[PDB]
Symmetry: C2
Subunit: 65 residues, 2 copies
């Protein structure tokens, strides 16, 4: 037996955060009131623009739907 | 880059084939006119009852939605 997972590479898009949000890579605040970072459209990971190139491309999540 | 795949184990359910259909494992006809075998609800693999025991559990398909 195994979980069903969606497995691919991240699909980051510039995101406008409405609440103070931290970088899931480095832990620092996503500064600004708009376009503060990128959110993966698939798994929800949030990263600074500068951290996009520091994260592994692997993007997985468990599918419950 | 990479494709995105849905990955898990097969989820077979007895299926009523409306046209002559073959076992995706062994190649022999799924005999009869109803409940001839099982179809994986995730990837569509068709198997005889007896072949359910023989196939690898791995179930993957490319997501195009
Ligand atoms: Zn992702
Ligand atoms: Zn960061
Ligand atoms: Zn399957
Ligand atoms: Zn068979």
């Amino acid at each position: 037996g195994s979980r069903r997972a969606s497995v691919g590479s991240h699909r980051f898009k510039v995101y406008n955060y409405m609440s103070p949000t931290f970088c899931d890579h480095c832990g620092s605040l996503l500064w600004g009131l708009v376009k503060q970072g990128l959110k993966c459209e698939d798994c929800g990971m949030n990263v600074h623009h500068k951290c996009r190139e520091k994260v592994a491309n692997l993007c997985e999540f468990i599918v419950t739907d």
